[PDB]
Write a protein that binds this ligand. Sequence first.
Ligand SMILES: *C(=O)/C=C/c1cc(Cl)c(O)c(Cl)c1
Length: 125
Amino acid sequence: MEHVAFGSEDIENTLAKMDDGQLDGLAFGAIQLDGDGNILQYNAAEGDITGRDPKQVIGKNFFKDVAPCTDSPEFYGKFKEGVASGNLNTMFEYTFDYQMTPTKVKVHMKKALSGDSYWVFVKRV
Ligand SMILES: *C(=O)/C=C/c1cc(Cl)c(O)c(Cl)c1
């Protein structure tokens, strides 16, 4: 296991060193999105939460195709406001229910250190 806690204040610094393999060592789901919501990285813990195969979702549009239940002001709206502003750091609970048993999670979105990239972190609640 990579020893990083969900919600850590410096999480973007810690995850900046991680290739796809290190990311798979986290205790929580981690997705990296570009500013348009395309999936750049998607770790094993996230796949365990959602059932999706991490390798297959990379390159897909998160808000349009993968996760339409997040296409709402409560999730996508927060993301895009952060992308527009350049300073995203928001945490909230949410239910994932698209083609899956509804699953309640805690979501933390945070701007990455790599230029136009944004993390979505997820854990069960
Ligand atoms: C609602 O449609 C959510 C779906 C969903 C959310 C996340 Cl974070 C995720 O990783 C997947 Cl594959 C689907």
